[PDB]
Design a binder for these strands. Structure first.
Ligand SMILES: Nc1ncnc2c1ncn2[C@@H]1O[C@H](CSCC[C@H](N)C(=O)O)[C@@H](O)[C@H]1O
Length: 327
DNA sequence: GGATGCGCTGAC
DNA sequence: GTCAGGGCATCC
């Protein structure tokens, strides 16, 4: 993550729904905002959250009385995406994990915060012929909010990972916010090899598959894209190897394969998956962030997380817009 | 819970 | 046609 000198959100309260690792909390706090409530039902996610923020998020949001939630200015929610991912069955609102947005709507209807800041996977924008995005838009508008949605790729904001997500920012209409803008992209100057730990710390992550098929030559010149160098098995998810001179393949929460969750990388002549700390770095988390003791759970958490830097730029812009109140 | 072979849609 | 997409099925 980056340093934010002008605290655009100082004095503003926000809630951390579907908290996870608390990526929204890190981003919003770096801009000066104060967290007044967090909710996350996964046991291990609650543990890592408490380990880093000192509080256990409340459980199952579908069972929380929206009226009990503290007053706040900004509602943050990177709600579940398994039901909208191209990797899944895409059942959307017909999936038990695909109706959480309506819980958000229920909370917004009651608390009416100045801003609703949501995030989901890129495919969310075109899921079900775009009908899914339209439902969220209509819902937000009927709740009396504007709706700004855009798919952003982490590689355009200083993070060496090809991770496209949709970001949805909504302003309460009475605020008359007319100048919100999504961050403008900038040249990437960091690559996977720049975030790697020393070899002595990741020997256990080395995988030697005798069915490895190198499909391309390694590159010496860094590039802002994923560069596949080979495959293992049938080359399915988790069986693909990339160059550390390019950017990271998108981390996964429920992904499989011998290189599950992180994908494989060619490092000093060997093929290995990433270490939880390297996953934290490709997601923009500071090295001071404490990862969950269970590597399996840590990989899951990071594969579900938000890219901090991207949220920081957006949060800064949200604050910038809220602060422009000329006579 | 941990691990991994897989399935197959879809962006372009 | 290529290969990415940040899940599913099932074993212990
Ligand atoms: N009904 C429910 N109540 C509370 N939390 C829920 C929930 N359904 C899903 N979740 C939680 O929603 C999260 C979505 S992933 C969001 C991760 C978060 N932005 C962070 O930065 O890492 C998951 O951690 C999941 O356990």
């Amino acid at each position: 993550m980056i340093e934010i000198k002008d605290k655009q959100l100082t004095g503003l309260r926000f809630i951390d729904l579907f908290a996870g690792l608390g990526g929204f909390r890190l981003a919003l706090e770096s801009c000066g905002a104060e967290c007044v409530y967090s909710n996350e039902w996964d046991k291990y996610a609650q543990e890592v959250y408490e380990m880093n923020f000192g509080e256990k998020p409340e459980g199952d949001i579908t069972q929380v009385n929206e009226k009990t939630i503290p007053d706040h200015d900004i509602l943050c929610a990177g709600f579940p995406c398994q039901a909208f991912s191209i990797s899944g069955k895409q059942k959307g609102f017909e999936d038990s994990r695909g109706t959480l947005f309506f819980d958000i709507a229920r909370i917004v209807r009651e608390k009416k915060p100045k801003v609703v800041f949501m995030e989901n996977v890129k495919n969310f924008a075109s899921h079900d012929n775009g009908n899914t995005l339209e439902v969220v838009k209509n819902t937000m508008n009927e709740l009396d909010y504007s709706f700004h949605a855009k798919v952003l790729n982490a590689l355009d904001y200083g993070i060496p990972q090809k991770r496209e997500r949709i970001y949805m920012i909504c302003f309460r209409n009475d605020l008359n916010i007319q100048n919100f803008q999504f961050p403008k992209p900038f040249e990437l100057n960091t690559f996977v090899k720049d975030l790697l730990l020393p070899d002595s710390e990741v020997e256990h992550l080395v995988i030697d598959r005798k069915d490895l098929v190198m499909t391309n030559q390694e590159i010496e010149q860094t590039t802002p894209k994923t560069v596949r160098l080979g495959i293992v098995g049938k080359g399915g998810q988790g069986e693909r190897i990339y160059s550390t001179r390019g950017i990271a393949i998108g981390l996964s929460a429920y992904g499989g394969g011998i290189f599950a969750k992180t994908g494989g990388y060619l490092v000093n002549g060997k093929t290995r998956k990433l270490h939880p700390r390297e996953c934290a770095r490709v997601m923009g988390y500071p090295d001071s962030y404490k990862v969950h003791p269970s590597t399996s759970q840590a990989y899951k958490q990071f594969g579900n997380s938000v890219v901090i830097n991207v949220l920081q730029y957006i949060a800064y812009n949200i604050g910038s817009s809220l602060n422009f109140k000329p006579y």
